[PDB]
Each structure stands twice: as structure tokens, then as C-alpha cells.
Amino acid sequence: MVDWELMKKIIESPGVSGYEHLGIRDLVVDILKDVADEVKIDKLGNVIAHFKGSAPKVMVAAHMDKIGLMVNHIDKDGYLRVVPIGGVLPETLIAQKIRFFTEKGERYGVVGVLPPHLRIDWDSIIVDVGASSREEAEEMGFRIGTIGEFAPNFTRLSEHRFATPYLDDRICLYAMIEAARQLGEHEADIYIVASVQEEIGLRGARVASFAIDPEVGIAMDVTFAKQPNDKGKIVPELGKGPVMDVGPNINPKLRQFADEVAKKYEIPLQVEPSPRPTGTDANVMQINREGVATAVLSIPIRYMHSQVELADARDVDNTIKLAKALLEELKPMDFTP
Amino acid sequence: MVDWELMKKIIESPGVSGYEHLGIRDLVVDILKDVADEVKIDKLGNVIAHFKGSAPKVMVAAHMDKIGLMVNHIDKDGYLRVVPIGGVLPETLIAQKIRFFTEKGERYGVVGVLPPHLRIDWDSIIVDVGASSREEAEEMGFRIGTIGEFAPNFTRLSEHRFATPYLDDRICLYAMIEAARQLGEHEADIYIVASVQEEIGLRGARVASFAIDPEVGIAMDVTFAKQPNDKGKIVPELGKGPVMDVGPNINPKLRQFADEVAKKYEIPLQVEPSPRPTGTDANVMQINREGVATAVLSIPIRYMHSQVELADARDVDNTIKLAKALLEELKPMDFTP
Amino acid sequence: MVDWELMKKIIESPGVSGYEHLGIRDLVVDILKDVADEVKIDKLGNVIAHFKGSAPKVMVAAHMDKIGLMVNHIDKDGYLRVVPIGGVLPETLIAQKIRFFTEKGERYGVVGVLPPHLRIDWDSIIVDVGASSREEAEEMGFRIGTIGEFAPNFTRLSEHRFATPYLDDRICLYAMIEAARQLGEHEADIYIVASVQEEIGLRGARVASFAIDPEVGIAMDVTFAKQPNDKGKIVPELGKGPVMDVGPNINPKLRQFADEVAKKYEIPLQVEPSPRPTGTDANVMQINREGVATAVLSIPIRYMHSQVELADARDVDNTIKLAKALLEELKPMDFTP
Ligand SMILES: [Cl-]
Ligand SMILES: [Cl-]
Ligand SMILES: [Cl-]
Ligand SMILES: [Co+2]
Ligand SMILES: [Co+2]
Ligand SMILES: [Co+2]
Ligand SMILES: [Gd]
Ligand SMILES: [Gd]
Ligand SMILES: [Gd]
Ligand SMILES: [Gd]
Ligand SMILES: [Gd]
Ligand SMILES: [Gd]
Ligand SMILES: [Gd]
Ligand SMILES: [Gd]
Ligand SMILES: [Gd]
Ligand SMILES: [Gd]
Ligand SMILES: [Gd]
Ligand SMILES: [Zn+2]
Ligand SMILES: [Zn+2]
Ligand SMILES: [Zn+2]
């Protein structure tokens, strides 16, 4: 079962990389304070929630930062110029609405388009916030350094599928949190991390990893799903279950284990071939300290890093189940390759 | 004064070129039936509302059709392919939501984007409606020929400025209708037309023009407003008043008259230099039958033909006033150049 | 006040990345041994100077390595081929003098130009050291691995502005050093680090960060200043004060504090929008161990990484004042974002 209302709330709560404290951080803390033995916030802004247990020591990470924008200029006529935080594609900004977090509250701006008869790149991205002068714009609360996000826009397309900005990674943050709320008996000593600044170099998990010092590390990010024009170069598909990579970033014995957990609980599990260190928190967890046994558990989505990221609710539900089952079944074990 | 609620309603009511009967037509008829002597709908779908009077015979036209999309393909996996109705730019479709009018009601779809590592044109525009098969998509109500529009999204940015799809031409349809509701005493014999199929060749006004046979014809469309990257090649500016073109499509004595009406009522009036026959209903009105004395009265907007068209409410209000004043002050006159 | 003689000396002292021991290290050790409680040199060459105090533990880093050149070949005719250590532009080498540190003392070389009628790249970079044969060059003290720098050339242009190779980062090393010298009572437990190998991966601040384990970290590097042909994309300006970034790498609470310090001491303070993890020592400090509260304090300069790096003495003076003031005002406080 999926809680649509809570999911929507977690997806749309403010928090670009480096600015997770604008909303999502407190929302996450307020949900986990009730179920975790202890909840802390570190100097980088990570939310670390301890679910006390015996062994092994297990870290789970789902990043709460969104890709977004920073204002770096305001011109005489009151237009804004912006620059990306994280892998924003400028092509997805044309004729779109941007949600800004100014000092007088949330405001909106609009990225225009040039009518054909007066005619891809970041210098063409000029934000219109409804002002006539630099002074009016400043008075609205706009500053050099003001942060913006894709305007919220949640759409259920069918019974199962839905499109919204920022499924990466709010969809896995939601699944991770949900699995934690339902967490039953477990031998493992579990740390649930809502990591910070993942979209700009995995920095949150790097630092939380150092603090916690786990034996097992599991990252919950989204992954690419088969979509139009992918040239058939994408293995996972929407609606066919959660995904767990295989490859160098993936500890073989941990990956084997998760497979059998899935078999026992009869949860469909997809394979994603990953020949490189992943672009997830598992990358830096694996090379933390003396080494960590790591894996990636992901929800497949279409249209990664756009206002229109699309998932299947059956994959979300199954991801919650497998996350829960894994955390409960995890026991001391030989992870040596 | 501007009625934000009514404006929003008129802007968002369904009606692409050739399909104004999906909503906007009845909305317009229902508003004008109360104030007009007689309201008719012609074979092309035009709404013609007569406000009886003496002379001259005056036609006013604001088009109620929107640019939009038609589905022309549904593939095995349930994706849609679409083609434009009117001057839709494909660049404005990336990561956008489309509102569809299917046979089982309104549904939504989403135009994806291709993640960078697997890489402007219409064959790249594939619509995702949350289906898995052609059959599921058909069952949803999708057909070859299903119509779609930009998803509604009204945003007031500041006290005066607001951005939304389809200000062209719902913003002038609203101003025109509003002026008609407030219409006082007038010597002129007035026909208020909500024209059809303007974005694909001015066809509605061509035909309504023939039926009515006016001596004076006035078109209310939107026009380009000064915006970023316009190379300073746009004269009108947001917030500096309604616009009335000057040029070959504009009868000199009618244009003179409107100028003095504006002076008397002290409504700011901008000039737009138009050396060609205009891309408005005034084009075909002027060459109707034995000739018609024509002018263009427009509201300036930024970002023409995108989801993010932007206007200034002060221009809207002033447009209502000048439209009203002109209709009341209009009297028999020598229009001979 | 700025000490021109001391500033010049610190700027022109030898020390390319990995070879900071050729001069700058001892000059730094010699100056701070007089004011610091303790001075150590680590395995990579960082100079770490302890200024005892209570809390918080504060690391300040100004890098003492310069970008430079390494000889990787000597041909039969005694010419050298070189390769860059750090972000050297080959364009800045045409018709320039190079200072080399040979086994027989400092020597000079020249990178030529080809007269046009005989006609951008590293293969066009051939150094002429005045030799006729490989042996003569060898006998002169030149080896594969010989290190070279931009020849020193300090010039005061006006009362406040001056241009020289290697303001990056000797100008902030100088500022940090002066601030330490003038340091009064302070609650913070202060470590002044003159770091090693910054222009090639922030190595050194990475290791010093680890040994010191601070709670607060401040980098003093140079930053870009508004200059000709910058497309107006550079916010900070010469003469308008020190600069402090805002963005993910900058702890919001520390940044707010520093702002407050500036206001109280009436020191002009600029903002630089930095949406990425910075290209300064603060990048690795932030992700050191369990995380650090970090900021960047920088001097604005023109023509970064060239022989004519150019600064304003008023910004230097103010950077010292702000550096001093910050270190004295710093106290325990909650840095949680
Ligand atoms: Cl990721
Ligand atoms: Cl038009
Ligand atoms: Cl640097
Ligand atoms: Co991402
Ligand atoms: Co149009
Ligand atoms: Co540098
Ligand atoms: Gd550019
Ligand atoms: Gd104010
Ligand atoms: Gd079963
Ligand atoms: Gd250890
Ligand atoms: Gd094509
Ligand atoms: Gd059916
Ligand atoms: Gd007046
Ligand atoms: Gd006639
Ligand atoms: Gd080469
Ligand atoms: Gd002086
Ligand atoms: Gd520690
Ligand atoms: Zn992610
Ligand atoms: Zn139009
Ligand atoms: Zn530097």
C-alpha cells in the first residue's frame, strides 16, 4: 500500500542541494522522531536516525536534496539570471515555472521563450518574476543567491503511473521512511540517513558514512527506466519491480542475500548492469574507511532530472516491502567476496 | 477593474481551433445571451452576438480558438504521437503536461525528455499517458484525432503581472466580453463576434464577416511586448497601455478617431508599426466584400504562443475601457482615406 | 595598512605544487614562529601553526603552491619541452620568461614565438635556455623534472592597484599571515594552515583537515573580478571589499555570522553566487571526517592564472581586517543549518 498524501508532501517539500533545511529536513525529522531511538542532524545537514540493534551495523541512504537553481544576477528591468545546482538541463526550462525561496516567502518566476521571428543554452535562460526594475525585484525579496526549484506539479496519469518533478530522490526518501515506520523485529543495528548534497558529488553520505562507520551500506536512489528513444540501452522497466544493480560497486554476497530475501517474500526484483561506480550514495559508502559492503536499491523512473519524472506505484510499494524485509532479515554474515 | 475569476475561467475553458465547441463556445454564449439582443452560432462555430443600434455597422472580433495538438498515432506500448494545430513550437513541449479531451473525459499526458547519456523537432515529441499498451490507451479513451492543449497553469507573479498559457486570445476575448457587459448607450449597430479558427488562417472571421457585412471591423488579438532578447525590435511594452497598430491594414480615419477617443477618456494608447497585413481577424475583415474600415486593438504580451504568456492587468483594464468608449462614441463618419 | 615589501616577498618566494619546500614553506615558518604557540610541518609539506584557544576549533587555509611547469625533455640542441603543473594556459606562455630551479641554482628560460612567414598548443611550447646542446643544458643544471615558474615581475600601477604573477594565492597567504600576526584575544582554538598542492586537487588541505579535525573551516583563496569581456558574468569587483561566497559549500550560519562581523566593523563585503562545491580548500574541508562548517573568504583579482594577475590594495587591507575580526569574534554557536 502507498500513502499518496504523504508521498506528495515529501516530494514537494523545499530543499535544493545545500538547502535541505528549507523544509524537507524538518519534515523528515518530524516523521522519524516517533519511531527511531535517536535522531540527529550533523554539521552538513544530514538527518541520521538510529534504530538500535545488535549486528551488523547497517547504513541506509536516500538523498533529500533536489537539483535546482541559484539566482546570480538581477538586471535593471528586474529580470533574473540563474545558474544550475546539480544536473539541470536548460532544455527543460523553456516556458516553465520556477518556485523561488526569497526572504519574504515563496515567489514564482517564469522562463520565457523567444517568438520565432526574432531568432539550447544557459545565457538564453532569463527569469521573469513580474517586476519592472531591479529595485522592485529586490523589494520582492530576490537576492543574488536566491534558490529556485521546478514548480510543483503532481499528476496521476493512470491508476498506477504518475509524473512530477523531483521523484529523484523524494520517491525513495518516501519509500525509505515508510519502510522505517513499518520496521518490525530486526537483529541488525540500523542507521537511516536522509542524505544531503547528493546531486553535487555525494557529499552528505560521504560524511555521514564516516560518522556512522557501517559494515553494510545501502543506497536508495532512482534509476533509469525503459522509455522512448533509449535505443534499447536501458534494462529496467516501469512496473516490473524494484531494481538492484550488479557490478563492482555491488558486494556479491550482499547482492546474493537480497536476491534470496526477494525470493522468500516473493517481491519482483530487476537487475541493472552497472560496470562503473554508481552515481549514488553507495559510491562513497563503499570506499568509506576500511571498506563497506554496499548495494543499490532503486525505483525505476522515466525522464530523469525533468519536471516530468514518471514512476509506477507498484514499484514503489514493492520497494517499501523489500527494504523492510531486507532490514529485518539482515544478520551477521561473511561479506568477503 | 478586472474580474480575475472570470478571466481565469475564460482562459482555461477548452477550445482548440476547430474545436471551440468543447467548452469556450457555450461559456461565451451563456455570458452574452443576457446582454445582447440576439445570439447565434454559425455553421463554422462562430458566436455572433447582436447589440442593436443605428449606424455604422460595426463588427468586433476576438478569437476563441487556442493553438493545440492532435493525436495522430498510438504505438504498441501505449505512447502517443502528436502533431500541431496552429503555431505550436516543439521546444515548448519538452517536460510539459498536456491536457487531452478524450471520449471518456479529460485526461493528462506528459512529454518526456531523453536523459543526456543517450543522445528541436516533432519526431522527438512522444506523449506518455501512463498506459502500457495501445489497448490500454484506447480504453482510456484515446483516439487517432484526440485533441490536446497546454495543461492549465495560471500564475499571478506580482500585483499586476500574470503568466498562463493561452492569453492569445482568451485575454482579449475576456476584455471584449467585459466591455460588452458594460456597454452603455451607443448609436452604432454592433456585432460582437467570438471568432473561430483564427490560429489556422483567420477562417472564422472571414465567414462571419461575410454574414454580418460591416462598415467598421475591429480585431482584438494579443501582440508582442518588449521582452528579453528581442533585439529591441518590439515597440509595445507591458503596462504602458493597449496597442493600436498603424499601417496598411489600419484605416487612417478610424485610427485617428480611436486616438481622440483615447485622449478624451485619457486612456494610454501605444502605437505598433505594422507594414504588412496583420496576423489577426482584421486581415480578412478588411478585404471582406466591398471593403471594410478596419483597426487592431490589442493587449501586449510576452512569450507569445507558449505556456508562459505574460500580461499586465493595467493593460487589460485599459483595453476594456477603450473598447467600451470606442463602441459608444462611434458614429456615422467618412472613412474614405 | 598593507606592507608592500612583505607582500612582494611572499608573492615571489619559490613554491610550485609539490615543491613548496623550495622557498615559501620556510618563509612562512619563519614569520609565524614568532606569533604562534606552535608550528609543525606534515608529511605533505603543509605548514600548520597553532594559536591556542578554547572553542570552536577553527582551520584557516591559504594555499602556498603556485601553478608552474616541469621539464619533461631536452633535445639535441638544448631546448626544453615542458608540461603544466596546475591550470597553466599555453596562451600565457608566448614570448614569456621562465624562472627555473636547477641543481646549480636559479636559471632563466624563454618561450619563443615563430615569425609569421614561417607558419595555442603545448607542442608549440619550447623553452630556450641559451644552450647549444643537450650536454650544455645538462651541465647548466637542467634535468627531466626541473621545475619552473612565471618569472617574477611585480608592478604597482596606481596608488591601489598592482599586477604580478601569482596573486593566487600568495596575496591571501599574505593576508592570512598579517591577520594572524595582529591577532588579539580570541575564544576560538585557531589553526592557521598554509596548504600544499591546492592547484592540483586540494590535496594537503585534505590531509591537514584530517589531522586537525576542526569544527569550522575557512579558505582564503582569490576569486574572479569583473574585467573586460567577462560578458557581465562576474559579480565581485576590485575596490569593493573582500568576497564571501554563498551556496552549498558555505554553511549558512557561519556565513550569516561573518556578515554580522563585517557590519559591526564596517567592512565592505561582497557576495559571490557559487552553486557548485568550490575550487578552493573549503571544498575538501567541508567533507572532512564527520563534516565541517565552512566558508570562503577571498580577494577579488583580474586575469586569474596569468603573469598579470591584478588586485586592489584596499581589498587586501579590508580582507585582513575582516579576517582578524572574524577570528577574534568567533565563539561556540550552533552551526546546524
Ligand atoms: Cl543520483
Ligand atoms: Cl493572432
Ligand atoms: Cl584556487
Ligand atoms: Co540525480
Ligand atoms: Co496566435
Ligand atoms: Co588557482
Ligand atoms: Gd554561455
Ligand atoms: Gd523595503
Ligand atoms: Gd507464494
Ligand atoms: Gd576502524
Ligand atoms: Gd521529421
Ligand atoms: Gd471497453
Ligand atoms: Gd483629466
Ligand atoms: Gd453589398
Ligand atoms: Gd599535442
Ligand atoms: Gd598612500
Ligand atoms: Gd571523530
Ligand atoms: Zn539521485
Ligand atoms: Zn491571436
Ligand atoms: Zn587558488
Side-chain angles (χ1 to χ4, degrees):
Chain A
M1 184 181 125
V2 155
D3 188 344
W4 292 90
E5 226 187 65
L6 184 58
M7 188 175 69
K8 185 178 189 292
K9 192 181 181 182
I10 278 166
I11 289 171
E12 300 185 346
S13 187
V16 168
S17 299
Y19 299 83
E20 306 83 346
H21 59 262
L22 292 189
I24 187 56
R25 174 255 254 162
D26 290 346
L27 177 55
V28 172
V29 171
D30 200 77
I31 296 174
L32 292 182
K33 67 179 183 194
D34 285 331
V35 65
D37 295 291
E38 30 183 357
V39 175
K40 276 136 167 291
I41 294 170
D42 64 17
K43 278 188 290 305
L44 280 207
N46 289 307
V47 175
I48 306 177
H50 192 189
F51 292 69
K52 293 185 174 168
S54 169
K57 211 186 200 181
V58 173
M59 171 175 168
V60 182
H63 63 95
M64 62 190 178
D65 61 313
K66 298 166 167 177
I67 65 180
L69 303 163
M70 174 188 290
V71 176
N72 76 333
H73 185 73
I74 308 186
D75 72 21
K76 64 182 180 69
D77 299 312
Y79 295 101
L80 306 183
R81 221 120 323 192
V82 295
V83 65
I85 300 172
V88 173
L89 311 156
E91 34 286 13
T92 60
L93 293 178
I94 311 311
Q96 301 265 13
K97 271 120 166 194
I98 310 298
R99 168 167 177 216
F100 289 97
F101 306 93
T102 76
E103 314 191 341
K104 293 192 174 60
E106 293 183 5
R107 295 196 126 266
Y108 283 81
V110 129
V111 171
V113 67
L114 185 61
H117 69 283
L118 303 143
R119 314 178 171 178
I120 269 190
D121 181 29
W122 277 108
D123 291 343
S124 46
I125 304 307
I126 313 303
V127 191
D128 196 332
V129 297
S132 300
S133 67
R134 177 184 317 107
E135 192 184 1
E136 188 181 350
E138 282 177 349
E139 192 61 37
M140 277 169 173
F142 286 104
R143 299 288 175 273
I144 300 300
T146 299
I147 309 309
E149 310 183 352
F150 300 139
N153 191 340
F154 193 90
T155 306
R156 274 186 79 170
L157 302 169
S158 62
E159 182 185 354
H160 300 310
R161 307 215 168 136
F162 54 105
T164 171
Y166 297 128
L167 289 185
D168 178 32
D169 192 33
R170 298 300 172 84
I171 200 55
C172 276
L173 181 59
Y174 162 76
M176 185 188 61
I177 280 172
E178 203 54 274
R181 289 164 91 214
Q182 305 177 18
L183 193 59
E185 280 276 86
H186 56 85
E187 186 174 352
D189 184 27
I190 301 173
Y191 293 80
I192 298 302
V193 181
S195 66
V196 121
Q197 294 187 29
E198 186 266 3
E199 295 280 16
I200 61 172
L202 318 172
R203 327 193 100 220
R206 172 178 288 288
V207 130
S209 209
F210 191 83
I212 301 175
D213 187 16
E215 308 157 52
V216 176
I218 293 175
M220 298 179 69
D221 207 325
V222 299
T223 202
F224 303 101
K226 170 169 171 265
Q227 75 170 69
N229 291 324
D230 61 356
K231 299 133 182 75
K233 298 195 165 94
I234 296 175
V235 180
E237 313 187 41
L238 290 192
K240 279 178 181 171
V243 184
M244 287 193 72
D245 312 38
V246 78
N249 198 156
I250 316 301
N251 177 275
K253 289 189 138 287
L254 177 58
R255 181 55 173 84
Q256 201 44 256
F257 177 83
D259 209 75
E260 277 145 17
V261 167
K263 182 180 177 184
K264 158 175 176 177
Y265 289 78
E266 293 174 9
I267 313 170
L269 185 58
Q270 309 194 64
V271 174
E272 171 178 346
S274 296
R276 281 162 287 149
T278 64
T280 79
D281 285 333
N283 191 312
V284 293
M285 284 194 288
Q286 186 179 46
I287 51 165
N288 178 68
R289 297 184 103 105
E290 318 207 348
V292 176
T294 49
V296 174
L297 170 60
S298 50
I299 300 174
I301 74 180
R302 268 120 74 152
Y303 319 130
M304 173 92 46
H305 282 196
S306 74
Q307 290 89 335
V308 110
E309 287 174 352
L310 197 157
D312 191 308
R314 290 166 286 188
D315 301 328
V316 178
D317 192 59
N318 275 322
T319 294
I320 299 165
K321 295 178 184 192
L322 181 53
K324 178 185 167 300
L326 251 168
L327 289 171
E328 290 176 354
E329 293 279 0
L330 220 29
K331 61 187 188 181
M333 195 183 300
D334 183 36
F335 291 111
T336 283
Chain B
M1 184 181 125
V2 155
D3 188 344
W4 292 90
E5 226 187 65
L6 184 58
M7 188 175 69
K8 185 178 189 292
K9 192 181 181 182
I10 278 166
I11 289 171
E12 300 185 346
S13 187
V16 168
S17 299
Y19 299 83
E20 306 83 346
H21 59 262
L22 292 189
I24 187 56
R25 174 255 254 162
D26 290 346
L27 177 55
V28 172
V29 171
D30 200 77
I31 296 174
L32 292 182
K33 67 179 183 194
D34 285 331
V35 65
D37 295 291
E38 30 183 357
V39 175
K40 276 136 167 291
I41 294 170
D42 64 17
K43 278 188 290 305
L44 280 207
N46 289 307
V47 175
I48 306 177
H50 192 189
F51 292 69
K52 293 185 174 168
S54 169
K57 211 186 200 181
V58 173
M59 171 175 168
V60 182
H63 63 95
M64 62 190 178
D65 61 313
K66 298 166 167 177
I67 65 180
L69 303 163
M70 174 188 290
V71 176
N72 76 333
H73 185 73
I74 308 186
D75 72 21
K76 64 182 180 69
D77 299 312
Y79 295 101
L80 306 183
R81 221 120 323 192
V82 295
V83 65
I85 300 172
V88 173
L89 311 156
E91 34 286 13
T92 60
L93 293 178
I94 311 311
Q96 301 265 13
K97 271 120 166 194
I98 310 298
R99 168 167 177 216
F100 289 97
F101 306 93
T102 76
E103 314 191 341
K104 293 192 174 60
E106 293 183 5
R107 295 196 126 266
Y108 283 81
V110 129
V111 171
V113 67
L114 185 61
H117 69 283
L118 303 143
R119 314 178 171 178
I120 269 190
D121 181 29
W122 277 108
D123 291 343
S124 46
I125 304 307
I126 313 303
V127 191
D128 196 332
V129 297
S132 300
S133 67
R134 177 184 317 107
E135 192 184 1
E136 188 181 350
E138 282 177 349
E139 192 61 37
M140 277 169 173
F142 286 104
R143 299 288 175 273
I144 300 300
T146 299
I147 309 309
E149 310 183 352
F150 300 139
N153 191 340
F154 193 90
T155 306
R156 274 186 79 170
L157 302 169
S158 62
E159 182 185 354
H160 300 310
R161 307 215 168 136
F162 54 105
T164 171
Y166 297 128
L167 289 185
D168 178 32
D169 192 33
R170 298 300 172 84
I171 200 55
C172 276
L173 181 59
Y174 162 76
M176 185 188 61
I177 280 172
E178 203 54 274
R181 289 164 91 214
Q182 305 177 18
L183 193 59
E185 280 276 86
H186 56 85
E187 186 174 352
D189 184 27
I190 301 173
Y191 293 80
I192 298 302
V193 181
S195 66
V196 121
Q197 294 187 29
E198 186 266 3
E199 295 280 16
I200 61 172
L202 318 172
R203 327 193 100 220
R206 172 178 288 288
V207 130
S209 209
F210 191 83
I212 301 175
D213 187 16
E215 308 157 52
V216 176
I218 293 175
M220 298 179 69
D221 207 325
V222 299
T223 202
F224 303 101
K226 170 169 171 265
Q227 75 170 69
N229 291 324
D230 61 356
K231 299 133 182 75
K233 298 195 165 94
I234 296 175
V235 180
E237 313 187 41
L238 290 192
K240 279 178 181 171
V243 184
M244 287 193 72
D245 312 38
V246 78
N249 198 156
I250 316 301
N251 177 275
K253 289 189 138 287
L254 177 58
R255 181 55 173 84
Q256 201 44 256
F257 177 83
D259 209 75
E260 277 145 17
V261 167
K263 182 180 177 184
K264 158 175 176 177
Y265 289 78
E266 293 174 9
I267 313 170
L269 185 58
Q270 309 194 64
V271 174
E272 171 178 346
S274 296
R276 281 162 287 149
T278 64
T280 79
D281 285 333
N283 191 312
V284 293
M285 284 194 288
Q286 186 179 46
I287 51 165
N288 178 68
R289 297 184 103 105
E290 318 207 348
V292 176
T294 49
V296 174
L297 170 60
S298 50
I299 300 174
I301 74 180
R302 268 120 74 152
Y303 319 130
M304 173 92 46
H305 282 196
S306 74
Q307 290 89 335
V308 110
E309 287 174 352
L310 197 157
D312 191 308
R314 290 166 286 188
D315 301 328
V316 178
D317 192 59
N318 275 322
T319 294
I320 299 165
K321 295 178 184 192
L322 181 53
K324 178 185 167 300
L326 251 168
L327 289 171
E328 290 176 354
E329 293 279 0
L330 220 29
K331 61 187 188 181
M333 195 183 300
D334 183 36
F335 291 111
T336 283
Chain C
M1 182 180 173
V2 151
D3 187 338
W4 293 89
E5 222 55 44
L6 179 60
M7 187 175 67
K8 185 180 188 293
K9 189 185 178 183
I10 283 166
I11 290 171
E12 302 185 347
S13 187
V16 172
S17 302
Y19 298 92
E20 305 87 348
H21 57 261
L22 296 186
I24 184 54
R25 178 197 74 186
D26 292 347
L27 179 57
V28 169
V29 174
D30 197 82
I31 301 172
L32 291 182
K33 69 176 185 194
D34 291 335
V35 271
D37 297 293
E38 209 183 332
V39 179
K40 289 288 178 294
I41 302 170
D42 63 19
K43 285 103 160 176
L44 273 41
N46 292 309
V47 172
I48 311 175
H50 192 187
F51 294 70
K52 292 181 175 165
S54 169
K57 211 191 304 182
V58 181
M59 173 175 167
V60 186
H63 65 97
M64 64 190 180
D65 62 315
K66 297 165 167 176
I67 64 182
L69 303 160
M70 172 187 288
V71 177
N72 72 330
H73 183 70
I74 305 186
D75 72 23
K76 65 185 183 71
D77 295 309
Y79 296 100
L80 309 183
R81 251 126 246 177
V82 294
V83 285
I85 302 171
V88 172
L89 310 161
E91 344 143 9
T92 61
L93 296 181
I94 314 310
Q96 303 268 12
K97 280 175 195 276
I98 312 300
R99 167 167 176 215
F100 290 100
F101 307 93
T102 78
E103 311 186 306
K104 296 189 176 176
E106 293 185 6
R107 298 198 64 96
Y108 282 96
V110 126
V111 19
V113 70
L114 183 64
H117 81 276
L118 249 16
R119 320 215 167 161
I120 184 67
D121 181 28
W122 276 108
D123 291 343
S124 47
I125 303 306
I126 302 175
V127 186
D128 198 331
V129 292
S132 302
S133 66
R134 175 182 313 103
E135 294 79 2
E136 187 187 351
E138 282 181 350
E139 203 170 30
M140 276 167 51
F142 285 105
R143 298 288 175 273
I144 284 81
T146 295
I147 302 310
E149 310 182 351
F150 301 144
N153 190 341
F154 190 91
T155 313
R156 272 187 81 170
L157 304 172
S158 62
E159 182 64 18
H160 298 136
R161 308 213 166 139
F162 57 102
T164 169
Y166 297 126
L167 290 185
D168 179 31
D169 191 29
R170 298 300 172 84
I171 191 52
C172 276
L173 180 62
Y174 163 77
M176 185 185 61
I177 284 173
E178 288 282 23
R181 287 167 87 214
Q182 304 176 16
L183 195 62
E185 276 194 321
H186 56 86
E187 183 172 353
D189 182 28
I190 298 174
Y191 293 80
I192 296 303
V193 185
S195 61
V196 125
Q197 297 190 32
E198 187 267 3
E199 292 277 13
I200 56 172
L202 319 174
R203 333 189 103 222
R206 169 174 281 115
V207 299
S209 210
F210 191 93
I212 301 176
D213 189 20
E215 310 157 55
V216 173
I218 293 174
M220 301 178 72
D221 208 327
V222 299
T223 196
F224 303 105
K226 173 169 171 166
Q227 74 172 67
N229 292 325
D230 63 13
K231 303 306 180 304
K233 300 194 169 308
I234 298 175
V235 176
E237 311 188 40
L238 295 194
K240 280 179 181 171
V243 181
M244 290 193 75
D245 306 41
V246 82
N249 201 155
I250 313 301
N251 181 280
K253 231 79 137 174
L254 179 57
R255 183 58 173 85
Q256 194 176 57
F257 177 82
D259 207 78
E260 289 299 355
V261 170
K263 182 182 176 185
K264 157 176 176 177
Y265 290 80
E266 293 173 316
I267 307 171
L269 184 59
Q270 309 195 65
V271 177
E272 170 178 345
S274 300
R276 280 161 284 283
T278 66
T280 81
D281 286 333
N283 188 314
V284 292
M285 284 194 287
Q286 185 178 45
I287 47 165
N288 179 68
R289 294 179 161 261
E290 319 207 347
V292 182
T294 48
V296 175
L297 170 62
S298 48
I299 292 175
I301 77 178
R302 290 195 187 132
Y303 321 129
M304 174 91 48
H305 282 196
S306 76
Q307 291 89 337
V308 299
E309 283 173 351
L310 194 158
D312 191 310
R314 293 167 286 189
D315 302 328
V316 179
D317 196 48
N318 277 324
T319 295
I320 298 164
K321 295 177 185 189
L322 179 50
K324 180 184 168 299
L326 253 168
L327 287 170
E328 292 178 358
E329 292 278 2
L330 221 32
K331 61 186 188 181
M333 78 180 54
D334 181 34
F335 288 109
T336 284

